Design a binder for this molecule. Structure first.
Ligand SMILES: *Cc1cc2c(cc1C)nc1c(=O)[nH]c(=O)nc-1n2C[C@H](O)[C@H](O)[C@H](O)COP(=O)(O)OP(=O)(O)OC[C@H]1O[C@@H](n2cnc3c(N)ncnc32)[C@H](O)[C@@H]1O
Ligand SMILES: NC(=O)c1ccccc1NC(=O)Nc1cc(Cl)cc(Cl)c1
Length: 494
């Protein structure tokens, strides 16, 4: 498929066209889409990626180029059929993480670097990035191409709001350093850019002093209105003396009754006590607020009084607070333990038809009514459902990443993640029907359900997703990837 002229050049020494190489680059975490590339590119340096992109961009037959991080995509976004998959991990040679601890401390990290490896390096200097995804085995460039949301995003914004600068290889093959003050149009496009404007090869990440330990809590609710009121109180300016991390989970009645006998967080005794709570008024769903209070040797003496003062302000079910006290690393890397349990049960390397939505606060109770109370009330899917609010004023609307736009008056929106697993491959159509039912319900009810980690097969879906930002995106695309070579699996510019 690829031009014959490629194989006579220097870049071809880092090309692998064998079946074993291309098959590894053919699938992703979702395990639903298979499309092998013509070749895998193993760059030594980011300059090699630039030479590959320039060659394609100036070629008589331009081929697609897709950077692949950890392949933690589920809709074939990192796939390049008819083209080349760039193994980003190949750049991991020599020092690829540089901390400047000396004004404000920062960490320079290769786009291929795992957040887990960034954390290890910054902790040696007692520093850490401020915002984390729940899963640390994801690349820096991979999460920054989306936004990177987690429990600290309500305070500091997404990971894209915690970046000082980027090194980007554009779709023309040009290596550009960009920030808020230099090449700012490229900087803004790339953050939440879905790899459409260039490959992130470096990110300068914002740092803060690292905590020592975490007081980690889970608070159970049966009433969604009380649960949402408390989450909104917890992310508000009122609560300087609150949690550093705020998340939430939705547990359907059957997933607790017919689910595992214990989990890494909950003991068998905890789950039986929760089974009683969930059956109290017939079968009902449990909503959990998950909070975390960071502390060091200096704040260790006031943390117990701080936790008591905060919890006394909340309205979780009496007798249903759950507490852990762990190191900062144990907390940030908590999902490693969950993956370990899933892997031993053969429940990890299975299909993941995942759906992530951004729902305006004004419609969160209507969303809950049609989705958890009507659609999923008697459903028993494997996996987890996340639900937590965020603050719009911590997001930069000049960046590509989309937040809901219907309520300009309202600073709050909710992230709702349907992280289901098909324990049997033939369960995929059932989870895909649930995905479609939630989206159809949003359209039918007039709920502005903006996708996070979006996927659309046609440009009409993407135009609806980008809304008032679409013309700016199309213009930026013509400027930075005119031949539409980059990350074609996104299916925005076919
Ligand atoms: C698998 C998974 C994902 C995940 C998560 C937990 C798990 C188990 N938890 C998340 C969380 O708490 N918060 C959040 O914001 N996202 C979370 N995710 C999703 C994940 O961040 C994204 O899927 C993201 O893409 C990271 O994935 P990864 O590093 O594995 O990248 P990929 O799958 O190979 O590629 C994704 C797309 O981005 C393009 N790409 C990849 N690297 C780059 C660079 N350096 N520059 C530009 N574009 C890049 C790919 O081509 C593809 O289109
Ligand atoms: N408890 C967890 O959050 C979890 C447990 C097992 C495997 C993954 C986990 N977390 C996870 O996938 N979080 C996530 C995943 C995505 Cl795609 C998007 C967002 Cl907002 C959050």
């Amino acid at each position: 498929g690829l031009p014959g002229d490629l194989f006579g050049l220097g870049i071809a020494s880092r090309i692998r066209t064998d079946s074993n190489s291309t098959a590894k680059a053919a699938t992703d975490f979702g395990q639903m889409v298979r499309a092998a590339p013509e070749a895998v590119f193993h760059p030594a340096t980011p300059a090699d990626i630039a030479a590959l992109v320039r060659f394609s961009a100036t070629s008589a037959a331009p081929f697609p180029v897709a950077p692949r991080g950890q392949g933690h995509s589920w809709r074939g976004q990192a796939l390049a059929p008819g083209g080349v998959v760039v193994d980003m991990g190949s750049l991991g040679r020599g020092p690829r993480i540089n901390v400047s601890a000396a004004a404000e401390p920062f960490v320079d990290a290769g786009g291929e670097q795992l957040w887990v490896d960034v954390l290890r390096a910054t902790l040696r200097h007692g520093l850490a990035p401020r915002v984390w995804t729940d899963y640390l085995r994801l690349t820096v460039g991979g999460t920054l191409s989306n936004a990177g949301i987690g429990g600290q995003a309500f305070r500091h914004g997404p990971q894209i709001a915690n970046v000082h600068e980027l090194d980007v290889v554009t779709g023309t093959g040009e290596m550009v350093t960009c920030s808020m003050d230099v090449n700012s149009d490229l900087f803004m496009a790339a953050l939440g850019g879905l790899g459409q404007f260039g490959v992130i090869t470096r990110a300068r990440i914002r740092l803060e002093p690292a905590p020592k330990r975490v007081r980690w809590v889970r608070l159970a609710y049966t009433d969604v209105a009380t649960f949402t009121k408390d989450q909104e109180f917890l992310i508000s300016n009122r609560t300087q003396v609150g949690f550093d991390y705020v998340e939430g989970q939705v547990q359907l009645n059957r997933s607790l009754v017919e689910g595992p006998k214990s989990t890494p967080f909950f003991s068998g005794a905890d789950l039986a006590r929760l089974a009683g709570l969930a059956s109290r008024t017939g079968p009902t769903a449990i909503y959990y607020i998950e909070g975390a209070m960071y502390y060091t040797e200096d704040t260790a003496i006031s943390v117990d009084k701080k936790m008591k003062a905060l919890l006394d302000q909340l309205s979780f079910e009496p007798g249903f607070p759950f507490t852990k006290d762990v190191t900062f690393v144990q907390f940030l890397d908590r999902v490693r333990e969950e993956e370990r349990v899933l892997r031993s049960a053969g429940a990890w390397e299975v299909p993941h038809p995942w759906l992530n939505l951004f729902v305006p606060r004004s419609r969160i109770l209507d969303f809950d009514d049609g989705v958890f109370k009507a659609l999923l009330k008697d459903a028993n899917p494997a996996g987890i459902i996340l639900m937590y609010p965020m603050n719009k004023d911590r997001w930069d609307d000049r960046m590509t990443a989309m937040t809901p736009a219907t309520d300009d008056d309202d600073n709050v929106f909710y992230a709702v993640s349907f992280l289901w697993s098909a324990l049997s491959a033939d369960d995929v159509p059932q989870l895909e029907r649930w995905n479609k039912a939630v989206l159809d319900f949003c359209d039918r009810s007039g709920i502005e359900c903006k996708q996070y980690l979006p996927h659309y097969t046609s440009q009409d879906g993407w135009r609806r997703h980008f809304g008032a930002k679409w013309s700016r995106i199309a213009e930026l695309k013509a400027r930075y990837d005119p031949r539409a070579l980059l990350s074609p699996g996104q299916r925005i510019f076919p």
